[PDB]
Amino acid sequence: PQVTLWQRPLVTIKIGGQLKEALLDTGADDTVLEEMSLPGRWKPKMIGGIGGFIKVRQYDQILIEICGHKAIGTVLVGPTPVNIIGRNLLTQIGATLNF
Amino acid sequence: PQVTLWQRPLVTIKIGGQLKEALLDTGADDTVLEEMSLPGRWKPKMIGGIGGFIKVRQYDQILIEICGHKAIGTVLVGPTPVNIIGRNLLTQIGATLNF
Ligand SMILES: O=C1N(Cc2ccc3ccccc3c2)[C@H](Cc2ccccc2)[C@H](O)[C@@H](O)[C@@H](Cc2ccccc2)N1Cc1ccc2ccccc2c1
Structure with missing residues (x-):
């Protein structure tokens, strides 16, 4: 989707069940x-x-689903x-900024 | 422009000369x-x-040019x-997030 920024850009995630x-x-x-609680x-x-x-605490190789991604x-x-999703995961779901 | 997020999304701004x-x-x-130092x-x-x-300190009604917008x-x-450009201005320059 496209997110305009009049609202906080919040999304649903699943992590750790x-x-x-x-x-x-x-x-x-x-x-x-x-x-x-993260397993690891x-x-x-x-x-x-x-x-x-x-x-x-840094945990590596954790699976997250950010929308259906x-x-x-x-x-x-x-x-x-x-809870903050940063550029490490944003690149993975293919997010871009456009103006 | 479309900005991918493999690097920090940094732009040049002009403010207060x-x-x-x-x-x-x-x-x-x-x-x-x-x-x-910013007048007012x-x-x-x-x-x-x-x-x-x-x-x-907060100053209202400041002119910014953000990537020449x-x-x-x-x-x-x-x-x-x-230096952070947050949603209050991202909205005026028409930025969106897309994935
Ligand atoms: O502290 C941050 N803020 C606070 C913030 C910034 C500007 C504001 C202006 C007005 C009112 C409130 C503001 C709050 C935001 C995240 C956030 C949002 C809401 C509440 C608490 C935090 C921001 O969105 C995020 O990118 C960075 C900005 C930043 C980046 C680099 C250096 C300093 C500040 N971090 C640290 C942040 C967040 C997560 C990080 C993850 C990995 C590495 C560094 C990280 C840094």
């Missing part, structure tokens, strides 16, 4: 999810945003205020 | 520029990101690490 909604985010290099191992990472740094990739889980 | 590059950010509701009167506001919150709106200025 759970249903979430997440923001489509061109400024975010990677995907960050609020606190979740993880690495600690910190990322920085507007107000500072947060510590997240599957992508596999890295997901960071942490204390974000909002 | 200065030239700057800024990230096109669909996740961000508003536009936040790094400290820059303003209010303080606090915005929250990942990591937490920064105090910004004009718009006028609110610009927040404050200690952001990257």
